[PDB]
Amino acid sequence: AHAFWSTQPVPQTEDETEKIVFAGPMDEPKTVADIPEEPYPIASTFEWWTPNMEAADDIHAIYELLRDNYVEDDDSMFRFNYSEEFLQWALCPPNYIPDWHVAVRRKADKKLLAFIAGVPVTLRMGTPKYMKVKAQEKGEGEEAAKYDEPRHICEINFLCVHKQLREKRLAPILIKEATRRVNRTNVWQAVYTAGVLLPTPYASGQYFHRSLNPEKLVEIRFSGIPAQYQKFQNPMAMLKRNYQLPSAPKNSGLREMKPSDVPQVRRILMNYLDSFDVGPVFSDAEISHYLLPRDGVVFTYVVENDKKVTDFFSFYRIPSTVIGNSNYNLLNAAYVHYYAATSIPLHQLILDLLIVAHSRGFDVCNMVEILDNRSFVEQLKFGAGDGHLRYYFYNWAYPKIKPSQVALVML
Ligand SMILES: CCCCCCCCCCCCCC(=O)SCCNC(=O)CCNC(=O)[C@H](O)C(C)(C)COP(=O)(O)OP(=O)(O)OC[C@H]1O[C@@H](n2cnc3c(N)ncnc32)[C@H](O)[C@@H]1OP(=O)(O)O
Ligand SMILES: CN(CCC#N)c1nc(N(C)C2CCNCC2)nc2ccsc12
Ligand SMILES: CN(CCC#N)c1nc(N(C)C2CCNCC2)nc2ccsc12
Ligand SMILES: [Mg+2]
């Protein structure tokens, strides 16, 4: 059933995943010295290429591959259009490894054919709370705690093969080469997400969407109008009214995050993330990189009253090409990022996220049901979509957890 995934150190079935009781590695211990020093073999008409993702022109070359060949829906209505600025932000965080950015080009004329990218992340990925309780009940606490320390691993994203090269077994070669380059730096686990079901997720959540510009969403067929709206004289007017928002934020003291806020935002974020079974650990440098505002890319606001930062939220921008429509070229989506609330309820904090995103010309707000995202769905008028995000580890046995026990946002 899976000619490639059956050869890899991942759980092979749900059932297998149902026997997993402690976090830990799948494969035998290996050293850097055991890992091939030469690149994985590839056909003579192709070559490996390491783009420099801080150099405008190489970022542009990767941006065009993804614009034309990255994820699209099944009806081919929308395709992601991650911006050049977003790609530099996502793939060059503090201490990134340039060698983990891996491309294939056609050797004759250098046509870009494929990409995959890894970045470092410091992840809490030890045995989850409900399984540590089982371990206590059995006298097995030492084995359950073995891998509690946060681990320096690889986050994989942006796997893409050109549409003309589909179904030729190029993605397995990309994945093996990326695994070799990560292993040559003495890293042995990765985390990744996909919409598709592969062997075997440790967590799965539905996507949720909150309409900000419902007339455009309906025009482009992102949205339909629920059937009940047909009992009105003016279904579209009633839909627009339903999703109307304030024109300015409601929380006293909301403002954009600035560099001086980094230590307090780090403290309140890390205290909050600690409560989830799987979640990242960020240094000051990483808080600065992932949360300070960046035009067109990431938007972050703190609540400061009386000179103290008590809450914050962030969102990022991923546009999509609207493939078929004649009225619109782009869908402008805002995605819920990290947040923390200590002074107000989360619904009250996230309402201001929707207000700011709407004021800035976003069409929809998207999120997965990770973190405490379920706690504001109904009041803030999010609805579940048809999509899911499934969370996977490479070379890590892990019990199944609920998506509300995941605190890692994946771009
Ligand atoms: C320690 C360090 C470890 C580092 C590595 C950790 C692992 C990272 C793993 C990657 C995490 C990526 C996270 C993201 O970026 S998820 C986003 C993935 N990108 C897209 O969806 C963009 C549009 N599609 C494409 O570009 C191609 O269809 C891709 C490249 C997806 C497959 O190309 P193609 O369609 O031309 O097929 P093939 O003949 O070459 O290969 C077929 C094999 O590929 C398996 N396949 C299909 N889709 C995925 C998928 N999303 N993740 C993993 N495997 C996938 C499939 O089951 C089959 O294996 P098996 O069923 O036969 O066994
Ligand atoms: C590239 N974009 C646009 C993302 C946004 N905003 C996609 N949008 C949707 N949708 C907008 C769904 C939302 C729920 N209803 C059906 C369309 N589904 C998929 C599935 C694979 S990619 C993709
Ligand atoms: C249904 N999927 C998963 C597709 C894949 N892989 C979606 N993914 C994202 N993303 C931005 C993903 C893209 C892949 N990396 C993680 C985020 N946005 C939306 C918006 C509506 S549906 C949807
Ligand atoms: Mg292929």
Short mmCIF file of C-alpha atoms and ligand atoms in Angstrom, two decimals:
data_model
loop_
_atom_site.label_atom_id
_atom_site.label_comp_id
_atom_site.label_asym_id
_atom_site.label_seq_id
_atom_site.Cartn_x
_atom_site.Cartn_y
_atom_site.Cartn_z
CA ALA A 1 0.00 0.00 0.00
CA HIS A 2 2.86 2.48 0.75
CA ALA A 3 6.03 1.52 -1.21
CA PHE A 4 7.94 4.43 0.37
CA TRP A 5 6.34 4.98 3.81
CA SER A 6 6.54 1.24 4.66
CA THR A 7 10.37 1.55 4.51
CA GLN A 8 10.55 4.52 6.98
CA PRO A 9 10.73 4.77 10.82
CA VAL A 10 7.11 5.84 11.37
CA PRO A 11 4.18 3.94 12.97
CA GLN A 12 2.61 1.85 10.21
CA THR A 13 -0.97 1.58 11.44
CA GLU A 14 -3.57 3.11 13.73
CA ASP A 15 -3.46 -0.17 15.66
CA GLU A 16 0.30 0.07 16.15
CA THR A 17 -0.29 3.68 17.27
CA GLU A 18 -2.83 2.32 19.79
CA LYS A 19 -0.14 0.16 21.46
CA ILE A 20 2.16 3.18 22.04
CA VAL A 21 2.52 4.01 25.63
CA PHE A 22 5.84 6.05 25.86
CA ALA A 23 7.60 8.68 23.75
CA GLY A 24 10.91 7.61 22.23
CA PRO A 25 12.86 6.78 19.00
CA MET A 26 11.83 4.17 16.45
CA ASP A 27 15.18 3.41 14.72
CA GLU A 28 18.37 2.01 16.22
CA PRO A 29 20.99 4.56 17.50
CA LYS A 30 23.22 5.85 14.73
CA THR A 31 26.05 8.42 14.57
CA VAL A 32 26.84 11.21 12.01
CA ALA A 33 29.79 8.99 10.94
CA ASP A 34 27.33 6.27 9.89
CA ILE A 35 25.47 8.61 7.51
CA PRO A 36 26.53 8.80 3.88
CA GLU A 37 28.70 11.77 3.16
CA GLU A 38 27.75 11.82 -0.63
CA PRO A 39 24.30 13.12 -1.73
CA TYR A 40 21.55 10.57 -2.34
CA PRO A 41 21.70 9.30 -5.98
CA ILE A 42 19.55 11.08 -8.53
CA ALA A 43 19.09 10.61 -12.26
CA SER A 44 21.82 12.02 -14.51
CA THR A 45 19.53 14.69 -16.03
CA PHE A 46 18.87 16.24 -12.57
CA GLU A 47 20.98 17.90 -9.89
CA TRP A 48 20.62 18.86 -6.23
CA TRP A 49 20.62 22.63 -5.54
CA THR A 50 20.76 24.42 -2.16
CA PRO A 51 19.00 27.82 -2.60
CA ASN A 52 20.09 30.73 -0.45
CA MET A 53 16.70 31.69 1.16
CA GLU A 54 18.03 35.05 2.31
CA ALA A 55 18.95 36.05 -1.32
CA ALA A 56 16.08 37.81 -3.14
CA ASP A 57 16.56 35.97 -6.43
CA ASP A 58 16.72 32.45 -4.98
CA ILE A 59 13.67 33.21 -2.82
CA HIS A 60 11.93 34.37 -5.99
CA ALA A 61 12.78 31.13 -7.82
CA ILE A 62 11.30 29.03 -4.99
CA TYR A 63 8.29 31.41 -4.74
CA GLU A 64 7.46 30.79 -8.44
CA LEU A 65 7.64 26.98 -8.07
CA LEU A 66 5.23 27.11 -5.11
CA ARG A 67 2.91 29.69 -6.69
CA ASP A 68 2.39 27.41 -9.72
CA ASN A 69 2.67 23.95 -8.12
CA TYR A 70 1.91 23.98 -4.37
CA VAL A 71 -1.23 22.79 -2.61
CA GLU A 72 -4.57 23.32 -4.38
CA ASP A 73 -8.06 22.13 -3.55
CA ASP A 74 -9.52 19.09 -5.40
CA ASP A 75 -11.71 21.30 -7.62
CA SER A 76 -8.66 23.39 -8.57
CA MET A 77 -10.31 26.72 -7.46
CA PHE A 78 -7.57 27.95 -5.06
CA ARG A 79 -3.80 27.39 -4.87
CA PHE A 80 -1.60 28.78 -2.10
CA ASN A 81 0.48 31.86 -3.03
CA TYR A 82 2.88 32.23 -0.07
CA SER A 83 4.75 35.54 -0.54
CA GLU A 84 8.48 35.94 -1.00
CA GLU A 85 8.67 37.83 2.33
CA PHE A 86 6.77 35.04 4.06
CA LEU A 87 9.12 32.38 2.69
CA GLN A 88 12.23 34.23 3.97
CA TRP A 89 10.55 34.59 7.40
CA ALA A 90 9.44 30.94 7.60
CA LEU A 91 12.64 29.35 6.45
CA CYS A 92 15.37 31.52 8.03
CA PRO A 93 14.58 31.66 11.80
CA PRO A 94 17.43 31.98 14.33
CA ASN A 95 20.13 29.34 13.88
CA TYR A 96 18.60 27.95 10.73
CA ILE A 97 20.73 25.50 8.70
CA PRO A 98 21.04 26.51 5.01
CA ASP A 99 21.78 22.92 3.96
CA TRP A 100 18.25 21.86 5.13
CA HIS A 101 16.74 23.83 2.17
CA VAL A 102 16.81 21.24 -0.63
CA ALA A 103 15.88 21.66 -4.32
CA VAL A 104 16.11 19.68 -7.56
CA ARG A 105 16.86 21.34 -10.87
CA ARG A 106 17.07 19.98 -14.43
CA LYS A 107 20.81 20.07 -15.15
CA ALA A 108 20.73 21.17 -18.83
CA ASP A 109 18.96 24.47 -18.39
CA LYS A 110 18.49 24.70 -14.63
CA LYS A 111 14.62 24.47 -14.65
CA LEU A 112 13.46 24.25 -11.05
CA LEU A 113 11.60 20.95 -10.46
CA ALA A 114 11.15 20.29 -6.68
CA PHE A 115 11.73 21.63 -3.17
CA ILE A 116 11.52 20.63 0.50
CA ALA A 117 12.63 22.63 3.52
CA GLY A 118 13.63 21.93 7.15
CA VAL A 119 14.02 24.44 9.96
CA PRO A 120 15.13 23.91 13.60
CA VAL A 121 12.53 23.78 16.39
CA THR A 122 12.93 23.08 20.12
CA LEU A 123 9.98 20.82 20.93
CA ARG A 124 8.48 19.31 24.08
CA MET A 125 7.62 15.82 22.83
CA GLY A 126 7.84 13.61 25.92
CA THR A 127 5.16 11.24 27.04
CA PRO A 128 1.77 13.05 27.33
CA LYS A 129 -0.09 13.68 30.56
CA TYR A 130 -2.75 10.91 30.26
CA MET A 131 -0.05 8.33 29.47
CA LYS A 132 2.21 9.46 32.36
CA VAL A 133 -0.83 8.73 34.65
CA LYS A 134 -1.00 5.22 33.15
CA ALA A 135 2.76 4.86 33.78
CA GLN A 136 2.37 5.84 37.47
CA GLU A 137 -0.45 3.23 37.78
CA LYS A 138 1.90 0.54 36.44
CA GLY A 139 5.16 1.46 38.23
CA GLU A 140 6.68 2.61 34.86
CA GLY A 141 7.40 6.32 35.54
CA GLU A 142 11.12 6.21 34.72
CA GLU A 143 10.56 4.84 31.21
CA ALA A 144 7.72 7.36 30.66
CA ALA A 145 9.93 10.31 31.69
CA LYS A 146 13.04 9.32 29.69
CA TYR A 147 12.47 11.89 26.92
CA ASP A 148 10.81 14.72 28.86
CA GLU A 149 13.61 17.19 28.07
CA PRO A 150 12.74 19.56 25.13
CA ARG A 151 14.47 18.26 21.98
CA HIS A 152 16.23 20.17 19.15
CA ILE A 153 14.61 18.65 16.05
CA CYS A 154 13.64 19.47 12.41
CA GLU A 155 10.28 20.92 11.25
CA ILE A 156 9.64 19.98 7.56
CA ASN A 157 7.42 22.08 5.23
CA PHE A 158 6.96 23.20 1.59
CA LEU A 159 7.40 19.80 -0.05
CA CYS A 160 6.59 20.39 -3.72
CA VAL A 161 7.11 18.60 -7.05
CA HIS A 162 6.42 20.40 -10.37
CA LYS A 163 3.12 19.30 -11.92
CA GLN A 164 4.90 17.91 -15.02
CA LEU A 165 6.97 15.55 -12.76
CA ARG A 166 4.09 14.16 -10.66
CA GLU A 167 3.79 10.43 -9.85
CA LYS A 168 7.39 9.62 -10.85
CA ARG A 169 8.64 8.82 -7.30
CA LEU A 170 10.61 12.08 -6.98
CA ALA A 171 9.08 13.01 -3.57
CA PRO A 172 10.66 9.92 -1.84
CA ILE A 173 14.11 10.93 -3.16
CA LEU A 174 13.59 14.52 -1.87
CA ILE A 175 12.59 13.14 1.55
CA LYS A 176 15.61 10.77 1.73
CA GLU A 177 18.05 13.55 0.82
CA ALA A 178 16.52 15.92 3.39
CA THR A 179 16.74 13.10 6.01
CA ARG A 180 20.45 12.57 5.18
CA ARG A 181 21.26 16.29 5.51
CA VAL A 182 19.40 16.53 8.85
CA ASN A 183 21.03 13.33 10.16
CA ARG A 184 24.51 14.69 9.14
CA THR A 185 23.85 17.46 11.70
CA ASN A 186 23.11 14.91 14.44
CA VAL A 187 19.28 15.42 14.38
CA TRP A 188 17.18 12.26 14.22
CA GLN A 189 13.52 13.33 14.55
CA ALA A 190 11.23 15.64 12.53
CA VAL A 191 7.72 17.01 12.88
CA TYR A 192 5.48 17.70 9.85
CA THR A 193 1.85 18.17 8.92
CA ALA A 194 -0.32 17.34 5.90
CA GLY A 195 -3.98 17.42 4.84
CA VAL A 196 -3.66 13.89 3.41
CA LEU A 197 -3.71 10.78 5.57
CA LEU A 198 -0.30 9.04 5.64
CA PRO A 199 1.15 6.50 8.09
CA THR A 200 0.42 7.57 10.87
CA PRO A 201 -0.67 10.86 12.60
CA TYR A 202 -0.29 11.32 16.36
CA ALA A 203 -3.02 14.06 16.27
CA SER A 204 -5.64 15.38 13.76
CA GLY A 205 -7.79 18.55 13.85
CA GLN A 206 -10.45 20.10 11.61
CA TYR A 207 -9.96 23.47 9.98
CA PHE A 208 -12.26 26.34 10.99
CA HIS A 209 -13.07 29.51 9.01
CA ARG A 210 -14.53 32.86 10.03
CA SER A 211 -15.93 34.93 7.14
CA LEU A 212 -14.71 38.53 7.06
CA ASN A 213 -15.86 39.51 3.50
CA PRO A 214 -18.80 37.08 2.85
CA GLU A 215 -19.86 38.65 -0.48
CA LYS A 216 -16.40 37.94 -1.95
CA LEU A 217 -16.23 34.45 -0.34
CA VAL A 218 -19.56 33.57 -1.99
CA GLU A 219 -18.56 35.09 -5.35
CA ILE A 220 -15.39 32.87 -5.45
CA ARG A 221 -17.12 29.77 -4.09
CA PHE A 222 -15.02 29.53 -0.96
CA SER A 223 -18.41 29.79 0.80
CA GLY A 224 -21.97 28.91 -0.01
CA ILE A 225 -25.03 30.56 1.60
CA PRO A 226 -26.72 28.16 4.16
CA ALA A 227 -30.11 27.13 2.81
CA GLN A 228 -31.94 28.88 5.63
CA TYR A 229 -30.93 32.29 4.22
CA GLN A 230 -33.24 31.57 1.25
CA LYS A 231 -36.19 32.28 3.56
CA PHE A 232 -35.21 35.96 3.46
CA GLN A 233 -36.05 38.62 0.86
CA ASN A 234 -32.33 39.51 0.58
CA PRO A 235 -30.19 36.49 1.48
CA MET A 236 -26.87 38.26 0.77
CA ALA A 237 -27.78 41.33 2.85
CA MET A 238 -28.60 39.10 5.80
CA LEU A 239 -25.35 37.12 5.34
CA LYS A 240 -23.30 40.35 5.31
CA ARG A 241 -25.09 41.59 8.43
CA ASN A 242 -24.48 38.24 10.21
CA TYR A 243 -20.70 38.59 9.83
CA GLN A 244 -20.36 42.39 10.41
CA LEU A 245 -17.62 43.44 12.87
CA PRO A 246 -16.61 46.60 14.70
CA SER A 247 -14.40 49.01 12.76
CA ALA A 248 -11.89 49.52 15.61
CA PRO A 249 -10.65 47.18 18.40
CA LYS A 250 -12.63 47.02 21.64
CA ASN A 251 -9.87 46.20 24.16
CA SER A 252 -8.43 49.13 26.03
CA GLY A 253 -4.75 49.35 25.56
CA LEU A 254 -4.43 47.17 22.43
CA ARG A 255 -1.34 48.18 20.39
CA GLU A 256 1.27 46.55 18.11
CA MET A 257 4.03 44.53 19.75
CA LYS A 258 7.46 46.17 19.94
CA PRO A 259 10.96 44.85 20.77
CA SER A 260 10.72 45.86 24.45
CA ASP A 261 7.71 43.49 24.83
CA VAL A 262 9.75 40.36 23.91
CA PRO A 263 10.58 39.19 27.51
CA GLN A 264 7.00 39.59 28.82
CA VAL A 265 5.41 38.01 25.69
CA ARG A 266 7.90 35.13 26.02
CA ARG A 267 6.96 34.64 29.69
CA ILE A 268 3.18 34.64 29.23
CA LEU A 269 3.41 32.48 26.07
CA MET A 270 5.69 29.89 27.62
CA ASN A 271 3.56 29.65 30.78
CA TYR A 272 0.49 29.01 28.59
CA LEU A 273 2.13 26.57 26.12
CA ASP A 274 3.50 24.51 29.00
CA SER A 275 0.00 23.15 29.71
CA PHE A 276 -0.20 21.26 26.34
CA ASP A 277 1.43 17.85 25.68
CA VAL A 278 3.29 18.82 22.45
CA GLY A 279 4.54 22.39 22.06
CA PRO A 280 7.56 24.55 21.13
CA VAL A 281 10.04 26.27 23.45
CA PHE A 282 11.18 29.67 22.21
CA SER A 283 14.22 31.74 23.08
CA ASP A 284 14.04 35.55 23.15
CA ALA A 285 15.54 35.52 19.61
CA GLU A 286 12.81 33.16 18.39
CA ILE A 287 10.03 35.18 20.04
CA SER A 288 11.43 38.27 18.24
CA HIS A 289 11.62 36.45 14.90
CA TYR A 290 8.19 34.71 14.96
CA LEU A 291 6.13 37.44 16.67
CA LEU A 292 7.48 40.93 15.96
CA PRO A 293 5.32 42.57 13.28
CA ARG A 294 6.52 42.14 9.67
CA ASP A 295 4.70 43.92 6.85
CA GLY A 296 2.58 41.61 4.72
CA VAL A 297 3.62 38.60 6.83
CA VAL A 298 2.91 38.56 10.60
CA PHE A 299 0.74 40.89 12.71
CA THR A 300 1.02 40.90 16.52
CA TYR A 301 -0.81 43.00 19.12
CA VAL A 302 -0.45 43.20 22.92
CA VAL A 303 -2.93 44.37 25.55
CA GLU A 304 -1.12 46.86 27.71
CA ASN A 305 -2.93 48.69 30.45
CA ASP A 306 -1.11 50.69 33.08
CA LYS A 307 2.25 49.79 31.62
CA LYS A 308 1.97 46.01 31.83
CA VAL A 309 1.53 43.54 28.96
CA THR A 310 -1.14 41.07 30.09
CA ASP A 311 -2.33 39.44 26.84
CA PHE A 312 -1.32 39.20 23.17
CA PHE A 313 -2.40 37.68 19.87
CA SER A 314 -0.73 37.15 16.49
CA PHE A 315 -1.92 36.22 12.98
CA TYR A 316 -0.09 35.66 9.69
CA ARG A 317 -1.02 36.12 6.02
CA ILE A 318 -1.21 33.44 3.36
CA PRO A 319 -2.86 34.57 0.08
CA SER A 320 -4.18 32.06 -2.45
CA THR A 321 -4.56 32.42 -6.24
CA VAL A 322 -8.23 32.32 -7.28
CA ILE A 323 -7.87 30.09 -10.35
CA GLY A 324 -11.24 30.29 -12.14
CA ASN A 325 -13.03 33.59 -11.23
CA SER A 326 -13.05 36.68 -13.47
CA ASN A 327 -13.80 39.18 -10.72
CA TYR A 328 -10.95 38.34 -8.28
CA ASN A 329 -7.35 37.20 -8.54
CA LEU A 330 -6.52 36.57 -4.89
CA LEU A 331 -8.05 35.26 -1.63
CA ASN A 332 -6.42 37.10 1.35
CA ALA A 333 -6.45 34.75 4.41
CA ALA A 334 -5.41 35.56 7.99
CA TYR A 335 -4.39 32.56 10.13
CA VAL A 336 -4.52 32.50 13.94
CA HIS A 337 -0.93 32.17 15.26
CA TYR A 338 0.20 32.15 18.90
CA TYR A 339 -1.68 34.03 21.65
CA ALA A 340 -1.96 34.17 25.47
CA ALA A 341 -4.68 35.67 27.68
CA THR A 342 -4.24 36.46 31.38
CA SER A 343 -6.62 39.45 31.93
CA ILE A 344 -9.60 38.81 29.61
CA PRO A 345 -11.42 35.81 28.22
CA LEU A 346 -9.99 34.39 25.01
CA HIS A 347 -13.11 35.23 23.00
CA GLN A 348 -12.65 38.91 23.90
CA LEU A 349 -8.96 38.81 22.84
CA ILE A 350 -9.66 37.02 19.53
CA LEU A 351 -12.57 39.32 18.62
CA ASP A 352 -9.93 42.05 18.31
CA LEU A 353 -7.93 39.76 16.00
CA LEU A 354 -10.94 39.48 13.69
CA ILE A 355 -11.52 43.27 13.86
CA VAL A 356 -7.91 44.07 12.97
CA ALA A 357 -7.77 41.46 10.19
CA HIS A 358 -11.04 42.76 8.70
CA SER A 359 -9.82 46.40 8.94
CA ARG A 360 -6.63 45.36 7.06
CA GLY A 361 -8.54 43.85 4.12
CA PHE A 362 -8.42 40.13 4.91
CA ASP A 363 -11.27 38.07 3.50
CA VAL A 364 -11.35 35.14 5.98
CA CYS A 365 -9.69 34.03 9.23
CA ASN A 366 -8.52 30.35 9.35
CA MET A 367 -7.29 28.11 12.14
CA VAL A 368 -6.98 24.44 13.20
CA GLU A 369 -8.69 23.30 16.47
CA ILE A 370 -5.32 23.18 18.27
CA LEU A 371 -4.46 25.19 21.43
CA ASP A 372 -7.74 26.52 23.04
CA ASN A 373 -9.12 27.47 19.61
CA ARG A 374 -12.35 25.51 20.31
CA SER A 375 -13.18 27.88 23.18
CA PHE A 376 -14.23 30.79 20.95
CA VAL A 377 -15.57 29.03 17.81
CA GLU A 378 -19.32 29.50 18.41
CA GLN A 379 -19.40 33.01 19.86
CA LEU A 380 -17.06 34.37 17.16
CA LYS A 381 -19.02 32.60 14.34
CA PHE A 382 -16.30 30.28 13.04
CA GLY A 383 -17.57 27.21 11.19
CA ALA A 384 -15.80 23.91 10.52
CA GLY A 385 -14.52 23.43 6.96
CA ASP A 386 -14.00 20.22 4.89
CA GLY A 387 -10.27 20.16 5.63
CA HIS A 388 -8.10 18.69 8.34
CA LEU A 389 -4.52 19.13 9.48
CA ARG A 390 -2.82 15.89 10.56
CA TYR A 391 0.34 16.07 12.77
CA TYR A 392 3.17 13.52 12.26
CA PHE A 393 6.58 12.69 13.70
CA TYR A 394 9.51 11.06 11.82
CA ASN A 395 11.40 8.47 13.97
CA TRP A 396 9.34 9.11 17.13
CA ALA A 397 6.83 6.75 18.77
CA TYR A 398 4.08 8.81 20.39
CA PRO A 399 0.61 8.02 21.83
CA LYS A 400 -2.42 9.50 20.10
CA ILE A 401 -3.40 12.85 21.57
CA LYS A 402 -6.39 15.18 21.10
CA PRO A 403 -5.69 18.28 18.89
CA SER A 404 -6.45 20.47 21.97
CA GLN A 405 -3.23 18.97 23.45
CA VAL A 406 -1.14 20.34 20.53
CA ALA A 407 0.43 23.79 20.85
CA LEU A 408 2.64 23.83 17.70
CA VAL A 409 1.35 26.13 14.92
CA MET A 410 2.46 24.91 11.49
CA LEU A 411 2.83 27.50 8.72
C1 LIG B 1 15.21 13.27 10.82
C2 LIG B 1 14.86 14.21 9.64
C3 LIG B 1 13.69 13.62 8.81
C4 LIG B 1 13.27 14.60 7.71
C5 LIG B 1 12.10 14.12 6.81
C6 LIG B 1 10.80 13.83 7.61
C7 LIG B 1 9.64 13.40 6.68
C8 LIG B 1 9.03 14.54 5.87
C9 LIG B 1 7.92 14.03 4.97
C10 LIG B 1 7.32 15.14 4.07
C11 LIG B 1 6.39 16.10 4.80
C12 LIG B 1 5.82 17.18 3.88
C13 LIG B 1 4.92 18.22 4.62
C14 LIG B 1 4.27 19.05 3.54
O1 LIG B 1 4.94 19.89 2.91
S1 LIG B 1 2.55 18.83 3.24
C15 LIG B 1 2.37 19.72 1.63
C16 LIG B 1 2.72 18.76 0.48
N1 LIG B 1 2.74 19.46 -0.81
C17 LIG B 1 1.74 19.47 -1.67
O2 LIG B 1 0.66 18.93 -1.38
C18 LIG B 1 1.95 20.27 -2.91
C19 LIG B 1 1.24 19.65 -4.17
N2 LIG B 1 1.69 18.27 -4.44
C20 LIG B 1 2.90 17.91 -4.75
O3 LIG B 1 3.78 18.75 -4.91
C21 LIG B 1 3.15 16.43 -4.93
O4 LIG B 1 1.90 15.77 -5.13
C22 LIG B 1 3.91 15.81 -3.69
C23 LIG B 1 5.33 16.41 -3.57
C24 LIG B 1 3.16 16.05 -2.35
C25 LIG B 1 4.06 14.33 -3.84
O5 LIG B 1 4.70 14.06 -5.14
P1 LIG B 1 3.95 13.11 -6.24
O6 LIG B 1 2.49 13.27 -6.14
O7 LIG B 1 4.58 13.43 -7.49
O8 LIG B 1 4.26 11.61 -5.76
P2 LIG B 1 5.65 10.76 -5.91
O9 LIG B 1 5.43 9.73 -6.97
O10 LIG B 1 6.78 11.64 -6.10
O11 LIG B 1 5.71 10.13 -4.45
C26 LIG B 1 4.62 9.38 -3.96
C27 LIG B 1 4.88 9.06 -2.50
O12 LIG B 1 4.73 10.35 -1.77
C28 LIG B 1 3.85 10.19 -0.68
N3 LIG B 1 3.28 11.51 -0.38
C29 LIG B 1 2.31 12.17 -1.09
N4 LIG B 1 2.02 13.35 -0.54
C30 LIG B 1 2.79 13.41 0.61
C31 LIG B 1 2.94 14.37 1.62
N5 LIG B 1 2.21 15.53 1.67
N6 LIG B 1 3.84 14.17 2.58
C32 LIG B 1 4.57 13.02 2.60
N7 LIG B 1 4.46 12.04 1.68
C33 LIG B 1 3.58 12.27 0.68
C34 LIG B 1 2.83 9.16 -1.17
O13 LIG B 1 2.09 8.64 -0.09
C35 LIG B 1 3.81 8.18 -1.87
O14 LIG B 1 4.43 7.34 -0.89
P3 LIG B 1 3.84 5.82 -0.71
O15 LIG B 1 2.38 5.99 -0.33
O16 LIG B 1 4.01 5.23 -2.06
O17 LIG B 1 4.62 5.21 0.36
C1 LIG B 2 -5.31 26.62 -1.20
N1 LIG B 2 -6.58 26.87 -0.48
C2 LIG B 2 -6.98 28.28 -0.12
C3 LIG B 2 -6.73 28.30 1.40
C4 LIG B 2 -7.39 29.42 2.04
N2 LIG B 2 -7.86 30.34 2.60
C5 LIG B 2 -7.39 25.79 -0.19
N3 LIG B 2 -8.59 26.19 0.22
C6 LIG B 2 -9.57 25.29 0.59
N4 LIG B 2 -10.79 25.87 0.96
C7 LIG B 2 -10.97 27.31 0.87
C8 LIG B 2 -11.93 25.06 1.33
C9 LIG B 2 -12.55 25.71 2.59
C10 LIG B 2 -13.73 24.85 3.05
N5 LIG B 2 -14.59 24.70 1.87
C11 LIG B 2 -14.10 24.19 0.59
C12 LIG B 2 -12.92 25.06 0.14
N6 LIG B 2 -9.32 23.95 0.58
C13 LIG B 2 -8.06 23.50 0.23
C14 LIG B 2 -7.61 22.11 0.20
C15 LIG B 2 -6.28 21.99 -0.25
S1 LIG B 2 -5.63 23.60 -0.55
C16 LIG B 2 -7.07 24.43 -0.23
C1 LIG B 3 -6.91 21.59 4.25
N1 LIG B 3 -5.51 22.13 4.42
C2 LIG B 3 -4.42 21.24 4.52
C3 LIG B 3 -3.69 21.23 3.13
C4 LIG B 3 -2.34 20.72 3.17
N2 LIG B 3 -1.27 20.25 3.27
C5 LIG B 3 -5.38 23.49 4.56
N3 LIG B 3 -4.09 23.86 4.80
C6 LIG B 3 -3.87 25.19 5.01
N4 LIG B 3 -2.53 25.46 5.24
C7 LIG B 3 -2.07 26.84 5.23
C8 LIG B 3 -1.53 24.35 5.49
C9 LIG B 3 -0.65 24.15 4.23
C10 LIG B 3 0.41 23.05 4.53
N5 LIG B 3 1.20 23.40 5.75
C11 LIG B 3 0.38 23.62 6.96
C12 LIG B 3 -0.68 24.71 6.72
N6 LIG B 3 -4.77 26.18 4.97
C13 LIG B 3 -6.09 25.80 4.72
C14 LIG B 3 -7.17 26.71 4.58
C15 LIG B 3 -8.31 25.85 4.25
S1 LIG B 3 -8.04 24.28 4.15
C16 LIG B 3 -6.35 24.47 4.51
MG MG B 4 7.24 12.45 -8.77
#
